[PDB]
Amino acid sequence: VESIIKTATDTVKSEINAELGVVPSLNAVETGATSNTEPEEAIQTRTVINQHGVSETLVENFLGRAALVSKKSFEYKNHASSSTHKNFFKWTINTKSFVQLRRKLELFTYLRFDAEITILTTVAVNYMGLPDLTLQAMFVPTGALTPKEQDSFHWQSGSNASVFFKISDPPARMTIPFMCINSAYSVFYDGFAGFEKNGLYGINPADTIGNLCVRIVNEHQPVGFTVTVRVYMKPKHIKAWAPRPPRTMPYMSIANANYKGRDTAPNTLNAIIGNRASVTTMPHNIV
Amino acid sequence: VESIIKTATDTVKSEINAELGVVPSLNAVETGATSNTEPEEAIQTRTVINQHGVSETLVENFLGRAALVSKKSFEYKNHASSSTHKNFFKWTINTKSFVQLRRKLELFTYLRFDAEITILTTVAVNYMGLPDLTLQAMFVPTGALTPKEQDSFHWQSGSNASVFFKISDPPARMTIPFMCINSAYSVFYDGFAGFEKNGLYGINPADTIGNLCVRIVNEHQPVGFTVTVRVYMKPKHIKAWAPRPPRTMPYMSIANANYKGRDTAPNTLNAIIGNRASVTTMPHNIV
Amino acid sequence: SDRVLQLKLGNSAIVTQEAANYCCAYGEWPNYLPDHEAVAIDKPTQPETSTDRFYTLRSVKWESNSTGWWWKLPDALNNIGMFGQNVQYHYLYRSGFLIHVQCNATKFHQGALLVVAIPEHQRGAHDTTTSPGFNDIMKGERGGTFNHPYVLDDGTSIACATIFPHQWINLRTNNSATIVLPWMNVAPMDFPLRHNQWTLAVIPVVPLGTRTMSSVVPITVSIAPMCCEFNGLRHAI
Amino acid sequence: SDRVLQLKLGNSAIVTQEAANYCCAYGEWPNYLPDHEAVAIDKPTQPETSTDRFYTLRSVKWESNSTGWWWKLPDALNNIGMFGQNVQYHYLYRSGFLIHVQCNATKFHQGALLVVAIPEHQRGAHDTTTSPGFNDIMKGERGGTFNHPYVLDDGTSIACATIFPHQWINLRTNNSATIVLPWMNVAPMDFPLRHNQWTLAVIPVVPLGTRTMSSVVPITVSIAPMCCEFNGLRHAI
Amino acid sequence: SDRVLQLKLGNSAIVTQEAANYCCAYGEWPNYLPDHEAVAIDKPTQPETSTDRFYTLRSVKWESNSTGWWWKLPDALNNIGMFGQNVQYHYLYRSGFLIHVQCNATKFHQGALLVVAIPEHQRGAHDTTTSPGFNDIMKGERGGTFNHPYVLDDGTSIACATIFPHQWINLRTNNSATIVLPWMNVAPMDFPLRHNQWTLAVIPVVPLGTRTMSSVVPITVSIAPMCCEFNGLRHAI
Amino acid sequence: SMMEINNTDGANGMERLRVDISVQADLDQLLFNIPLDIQLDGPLRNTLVGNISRYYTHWSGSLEMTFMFCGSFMATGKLILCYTPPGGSCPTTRETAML
Amino acid sequence: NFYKDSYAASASKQDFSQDPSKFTEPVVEGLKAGAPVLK
Amino acid sequence: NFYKDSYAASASKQDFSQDPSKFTEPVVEGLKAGAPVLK
Amino acid sequence: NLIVPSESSDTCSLIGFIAAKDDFSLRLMRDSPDIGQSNHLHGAEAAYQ
Ligand SMILES: CC(=O)N[C@@H]1[C@@H](O)[C@H](O[C@@H]2O[C@H](CO)[C@H](O)[C@H](O[C@]3(C(=O)O)C[C@H](O)[C@@H](NC(C)=O)[C@H]([C@H](O)[C@H](O)CO)O3)[C@H]2O)[C@@H](CO)O[C@H]1O
Ligand SMILES: CC(=O)N[C@@H]1[C@@H](O)[C@H](O[C@@H]2O[C@H](CO)[C@H](O)[C@H](O[C@]3(C(=O)O)C[C@H](O)[C@@H](NC(C)=O)[C@H]([C@H](O)[C@H](O)CO)O3)[C@H]2O)[C@@H](CO)O[C@H]1O
Incomplete structure (x- = not known):
């Protein structure tokens, strides 16, 4: 059943059919199998040597795109009287915050991939020039010890991987390997990640890549700036299993699949598709 | 009839001719064929080994140049009270806005090529320095969903291709493949792209590469700047078919071949070539 | 020929005279854990017929x-028979499942049930940001009910649920559905009391209807674990 | 020898005793769509002689x-004979064309007509930014007239129109022009009612003139589709 | 096995799950006109799938x-689709026909229809010496009705009509009848507008009856010309 | 996957996923039609082919529509399903659609 | 790939293997073309 | 070309094939040199 | 016509399905119009706390 497919299948010419006991257009949906009726059996076809390629739909390409997974802006200044991200922040990595990437990953049940991480930094004066700051992004394992201050000694990063980059350089980039304790990440998890009953549902910690701690290395300047850090993730060397029904209702939370639907169709809880006047009303009918 | 030509053809010496029934200088334009009279048959020639190359006129080179196809300047600032491109713009790609490139492409009926796109950015203060801004150019398919704000979540670009670049870097560059749904682009289209009768004439949507959405990623600065984005296109891996009469009348619109002509010759509707006193008046006659 | 079927495992057997072939999830068949995929090193118990x-x-x-x-699954069976006992006494379990859903009526009745086996069916709650609780998920042998089957209670859709292993019970055609499920997980074994590999969903896409004598029309589910293995023996939980 | 010619297709034939050889557009000849270039998979109808x-x-x-x-073309013929019927009943069509333009006069008449087949002749409107409308383009069998032949009604020029397949009818020389056109498009087939592959243009570059008895001098056009194929059968539009 | 059947011609297909084998009139099958039986010398058009x-x-x-x-036939189809267009534009036509009559009901309904293809069914008028008129014969797509089916409206009898190619639709047995008709005439081709080779007759020998819910029970006729050929092209009549 | 053919006001949830047909009093009755752009909103949008195709801009290939009758065993009937290539207005009579 | 860890390599877009039947026809008994599916 | 997609490659300026006759002499019967074109 | 006896429902349902055949091809990937967001999802900002 398995084979190598590089182009769409060709069509063979077909003749008139009038055979007793042969009914290719009839099927039985109850079996769970999709109709196997071929065009050649439904109508008279001609021969067509189809050269249309199928590579753009390869899973590697479908998911192989650097998508925004994190966007964080904070104030870079003297935080003497701040209540607030004081020249640094910590982000628990997750791929559930931005909907375009989330919906695509959720088209699958399990996924195994390495993750190329790209970090883009932008600055704005709160005018007399934009400073070329040096930033440090330290990878701190899930639930591990994160820094509490811009100048914490935790940033010495003796074992944690840290990347130092300048705003004037191209975006920083590095690859995090497929690091799950299992053979694949669980895009969905129908269970509780704890031995007691009060744990969180649908959250398998084994699927959390980890914490990303980012700080501005430079001491504060006499004036304040707004610094925004954007993180992009591109999966590669991908293996995917068990495709799933696409998300239709708007997402509500990054922690679950809770739904509500839009106020009015399309994509409302009682009507996914927009309405038409009746089942015999042809929208966009050619007049 | 087809052959490999790398240099202009040589000339062979010729002798005196006085043969009955042989009249190489006479032709019949009515047949539609161009005169086949050779220099050797019209006059007495010497032998000439011609080494003049013909590569600069290869179609690949003739059209192989990065030409300006889009120039857009907008204000980068706090657009709180703006009616206006608010730190971003959308451009429906087309090769009909700048006349030098347009006229050359229109020397052909059909064209198949990949397009190298180069994006050049320039800035001016509306003095205390020029900021090294980061821009994002997102390719959004023809008629597809474009962002409505500088900070729209649409910019997360989960599947659309986006290129992030700095004003301090060399111009951004990437190649858009020959993406037409047909085997070649239609430089001219004698038809209507819709099943009804009110559609636009001469516009085959299949020939619109798509939308280019460009924004400044940085939040606005305390002062305003004028940012200009220039897009250049260079076709390559070119195949061309059916050459055409060159455009003579000034272009009037990017949506059609409408014409009016200049107010006075040259290139006026009733006179393409400038006038001379009479058909026996030699302009620039050597005195 | 493909309308009659007998399933026999252990001391149990089931026959149907109105089947519609049967489904092997993703074209696979249950099997015991091979040495080259094993993780837990203690010798497993393979009770066979008792489970x-x-x-x-x-x-x-x-x-x-x-x-x-x-x-x-395995929640629905975690407290039934010897399968339930092994589950309670062992930290780890592994198995496939043979599912047989039954529903008969009359030549005058109409209705269609989608019978689908959903892997990792993580439920969502309706109109709230609070995640579903333990009792909303673990129903045991009684099973649960769909609040919004139209979106599979997870914000997606039943329309595309056919992407999962399934069959239908269309009353005018058949009276049973059969699906064979292999072990489905990212790990070779798992703790049975906190994670459910599969969710059996039976949804009436076409409601039950008739104009003949009204009778109670039941839907019955019979499930047979296959190639059961248990590791990490201790006391019962 | 190259001044006389007989064209015969189906139940029709034409002869001329004052031809000037004949033109095969771009040196090609019409042909049916080969399997390695086909797109529409339904078996096409090839009516042959009726079209x-x-x-x-x-x-x-x-x-x-x-x-x-x-x-x-094909607009001029979309409502004529069986070619017109096939065009109306099918979403897709494909064909070449054999064009024969006729115009005879007297040994005392003078005049020269440029007879050119223009591919994708997208018309432009004069002195306005508004694009030409449907009725400015689709004239059918009646055809249209040039407003500014000097620029081919498209802002270019008739002077360079010889770059397209053509012949001339110079009264002192010949009384007919013949051009064979192959399928010309970027797609293997097309919807005949909204796109015209070719435009036949007949323009008097040298006006008709004489000092002998004045008579009505007509110009007649005869066109034969070649290797017609139609796909996407349905009702007539 | 001989109760299910699929007929496919051109872009059309039909299936039945309650057939009764199918009839090939006189054991023949449609075919194109061979050179040794041809009369009209012009090259014919064989539109194939469009007709x-x-x-x-x-x-x-x-x-x-x-x-x-x-x-x-061909009257009933002389104004339908591309078959109708070819018929109107050509003096001569030739073809076979694949006939499929449809009628379904309920296991509680009874009735029997004789479905017979009569060659040269020349109608007679009742109680008058005046021959039937043009409008009594040419009904087109609407077809006609029997005045005295007992004598086949021609003074003979329906009792012996079984001598002609036929099938029956007996509600308790089948819901469709299929008859393949070859060209039937004394000439290789004919003028389609003044002569009908075959007449499809559907007659209820046993009336429709039931004691269950009364519903409209339709009878539907689908006809596919086969191996169509047309000669003598001209303008449409 | 299931087409949402009954995408009409008044049809809620799963009612939108099935098309009800009744015993007719008249002949050759039109039962329903389906717009075919798998790239626009309509009965075909929320299907496996529709959802995935909408992550792309160009498409080519044959589609297949399968209908399962879910009436009772004692119910009988014959329907005609027609695909009309583009060019005109949607057919409203069987005599036209049948072509 | 000049890096020492293979997971650092560029994408692998060469796996053209397919087996749609695991999703389209997961029935134990293969369905023959033309033959009535239910017999 | 170090990119994986061939369309990304640099220009192809090596096609020296030509056939002017498709534009200069598209007549069905070739015209002989010196011979009267119309005969 | 749909024909049924007295005790069968006289209104029946059809379920329509659609799928692509293996001669299908898709090109030019783009963001899907079927999903979008105008605000941060609940809990997104908490990932920073
Ligand atoms: C006025 C009328 O005759 N009929 C309307 C009918 O047009 C309307 O349908 C909606 O119409 C819009 C066009 O205005 C879109 O086509 C809607 O579709 C989609 C889209 O394809 O863009 C589907 C998509 O899934 C939706 N996305 C999300 C993330 O929710 C988008 C989205 O809502 C829009 O883009 C909004 O910006 O819409 C289509 O449903 C129906 C509604 O019942 O009502 C008729 O009366
Ligand atoms: C004064 C006299 O004796 N005779 C004029 C004669 O010179 C004039 O001809 C025009 O003269 C100018 C030089 O002044 C150019 O040579 C004009 O030619 C072109 C050019 O080659 O540059 C042709 C070209 O196509 C034109 N381009 C466009 C885009 O329109 C340009 C263009 O107009 C100029 O460059 C303007 O800047 O001109 C040539 O015609 C004729 C006019 O009738 O009149 C004599 O009296």
Whole structure:
């Protein structure tokens, strides 16, 4: 059943059919199998040597795109009287915050991939020039010890991987390997990640890549700036299993699949598709 | 009839001719064929080994140049009270806005090529320095969903291709493949792209590469700047078919071949070539 | 020929005279854990017939306004027979499942049930940001009910649920659905009390209807674990 | 020898005793769509003789002040004979064309007509930014007239129109022009009612003139589709 | 096995799950006109798929007091689709026909229809010496009705009509009848507008009856010309 | 996957996923039609082919529509399903659709 | 790939293997073309 | 070309094939040199 | 016509399905119009706390 497919299948010419006991257009949906009726059996076809390629739909390409997974802006200044991200922040990595990437990953049940991480930094004066700051992004394992201050000694990063980059350089980039304790990440998890009953549902910690701690290395300047850090993730060397029904209702939370639907169709809880006047009303009918 | 030509053809010496029934200088334009009279048959020639190359006129080179196809300047600032491109713009790609490139492409009926796109950015203060801004150019398919704000979540670009670049870097560059749904682009289209009768004439949507959405990623600065984005296109891996009469009348619109002509010759509707006193008046006659 | 079928495992057997072939999830078949995929090093127990047999759960009634039913595995069987005992005494378990859903009526009745096995069916809650609680998920042998079958109670859709292993019970055609499920997980074994590999969903896409004598029309589910293996023996939880 | 010619297709034939050889557009000849270039998978209908034959359109009068005439293909024939019927009943069509333009006069008459087949002749409108409308383009069998033949009604020029397949009818030399057109498009087939592959243009570059008895001098166009194929059968539009 | 059948011609297909084998008139099968039997010397057009496909006519209602229906060929199709266009544009035509009559009911309904293809069914008028008129014979797509089915409206008898190619639709047994008709004439081709080779007759020998819910029971006719050929091209009549 | 053919006001949830047909009093009755752009909103949008195709801009290939009758065993009937290539207005009579 | 860890390599877009039947026809007994599916 | 997609490659300026006759002499019967074109 | 006996429902349902055949091809990837967001999802900002 398995084979190598590089182009769409060709069509063979077909003749008139009038055979007793042969009914290719009839099927039985109850079996769970999709109709196997071929065009050649439904109508008279001609021969067509189809050269249309199928590579753009390869899973590697479908998911192989650097998508925004994190966007964080904070104030870079003297935080003497701040209540607030004081020249640094910590982000628990997750791929559930931005909907375009989330919906695509959720088209699958399990996924195994390495993750190329790209970090883009932008600055704005709160005018007399934009400073070329040096930033440090330290990878701190899930639930591990994160820094509490811009100048914490935790940033010495003796074992944690840290990347130092300048705003004037191209975006920083590095690859995090497929690091799950299992053979694949669980895009969905129908269970509780704890031995007691009060744990969180649908959250398998084994699927959390980890914490990303980012700080501005430079001491504060006499004036304040707004610094925004954007993180992009591109999966590669991908293996995917068990495709799933696409998300239709708007997402509500990054922690679950809770739904509500839009106020009015399309994509409302009682009507996914927009309405038409009746089942015999042809929208966009050619007049 | 087809052959490999790398240099202009040589000339062979010729002798005196006085043969009955042989009249190489006479032709019949009515047949539609161009005169086949050779220099050797019209006059007495010497032998000439011609080494003049013909590569600069290869179609690949003739059209192989990065030409300006889009120039857009907008204000980068706090657009709180703006009616206006608010730190971003959308451009429906087309090769009909700048006349030098347009006229050359229109020397052909059909064209198949990949397009190298180069994006050049320039800035001016509306003095205390020029900021090294980061821009994002997102390719959004023809008629597809474009962002409505500088900070729209649409910019997360989960599947659309986006290129992030700095004003301090060399111009951004990437190649858009020959993406037409047909085997070649239609430089001219004698038809209507819709099943009804009110559609636009001469516009085959299949020939619109798509939308280019460009924004400044940085939040606005305390002062305003004028940012200009220039897009250049260079076709390559070119195949061309059916050459055409060159455009003579000034272009009037990017949506059609409408014409009016200049107010006075040259290139006026009733006179393409400038006038001379009479058909026996030699302009620039050597005195 | 492909309408009659007999399933026999252990001391249990089931026959149907109105089947519609049968489904092998993703074209696979259950099997024991091979040495080259094993992780837990203690010698496993493979009880065979005491656990690999059909367990019939309590029936449910198909009503004109029913929204659908679901049963999570292994939860639905974690307290039934010797399968339940092994599950309670062992930290780790592994198995496939042979599912047989039953529903007969009359030549005058109409209705269509989608019978689908959903891997990792993580439920969502409706109109709230609070995640579903333990009791909303672990229903055991009784199973649960769909609140919004139209979106599979997870914000997606039943329309595309056919992407999962399934069959249908269309009353004018058949009276049973059969699906064979292999071990489905990212790990070779798992803790049975906190994670459900599969969710059996039975949803009436076409409501039950007739103009003949009204009778209670039940839907019954029989499930047989296959190639059961247990590791990490201790006391019962 | 190259001045006399007989064209025969289907139940139609045409002869001329004053031809000037004949033109094969771009040195090609019409042919049926090969399997390695096909897209539409339904078996096409190839009516042959019922469609591949000469259709003679209404004549036009060559006057001393005429600017020229044009006919777009397949539009000019979309409502004529069986070619027209196949076009109306099918979403897709494909064909080449054999064009024969006729115009005879007297040994005392003078005049020269450029007979050119223009691929994708997208018309432009004069002195306005508004694009030409449907009725400015689709004239059918009657064809249209040139407003500014000097620029081919598209802002270019008739002077360079010889770059397109053509012949001339110079009264002292010949009385007919013949051009064979192959399928010309970027797609293997097309919807005949909204796109015209070719435009036949007949323009008097040298006006009709004489000092002998004045007579009505007509110009007649006969066109024969070649290797017609139709796909996407349905009801007539 | 001989109760299910799929017929496919051109872009059309039909299936039945309650057939009764199918009839090939006189054991023959349609074919194109061979050179050794040809008369008209012009090259014929063989449109194939545009004409050799199923055309479904308007249905009729089977009532308790119905006398029967008839449709003459090619008259019934002379104004339908591309078959109709070719017929109107050509003096001569030739073809076979694949006939499929449809009528389903309930396991509680009874009735029997004789479905017979009569060659040269020359009608007679009742109680008068005046021959039937043009409008009594040419009904087109609507077909006609039997006045005295007992004598086949021609003074003979329906009792012996079984001598002609036929099948029956006996409600308790089948819901469709299929008859393949070859070209039937004394000439290789004919003028389609003045002569009908075959007449399809559907007559209820056993009236429709039941004691269950009364419903409109239609009878539908689908006809596919086969191996169509046309000669003598001209303008449309 | 299931087409949402009954995408009409008044049809809620799963009612939108099935098309009800009744015993007719008249002949050759039109039962329903389906717009075919798998790239626009309509009965075909929320299907496996529709959802995935909408992550792309160009498409080519044959589609297949399968209908399962879910009436009772004692119910009988014959329907005609027609695909009309583009060019005109949607057919409203069987005599036209049948072509 | 000049890096020492293979997971650092560029994408692998060469796996053209397919087996749609695991999703389209997961029935134990293969369905023959033309033959009635239910017998 | 170090990119994986061939369309990304640099220009192809090596096609020296030509056939002017498709534009200069598209007549069905070739015209012989010196011979009267119309005969 | 749909024909049924007295005790069968006289209104029946059809379920329509659609799928692509293996001669299908898709090109030019783009963001899907079927999903979008105008605000941060609940809990997104908490990932920073
Ligand atoms: C006015 C009328 O005749 N009929 C309307 C009908 O047009 C309307 O349908 C909606 O119409 C819009 C066009 O205005 C879109 O086509 C809607 O579709 C989609 C889209 O394709 O863009 C589907 C998509 O899934 C939706 N996305 C999300 C993330 O929710 C988008 C989205 O809502 C829009 O883009 C909004 O910006 O819409 C289509 O449903 C129906 C509604 O019942 O009502 C008729 O009366
Ligand atoms: C004064 C006299 O004796 N005779 C003029 C004669 O010179 C004039 O001809 C025009 O003269 C100019 C030089 O002044 C150019 O040579 C004009 O030619 C072109 C050019 O080659 O540059 C042709 C070209 O196509 C034109 N381009 C466009 C885009 O329109 C340009 C263009 O107009 C100029 O460059 C303007 O800047 O001109 C040539 O015609 C004729 C006019 O009738 O009149 C004589 O009296």
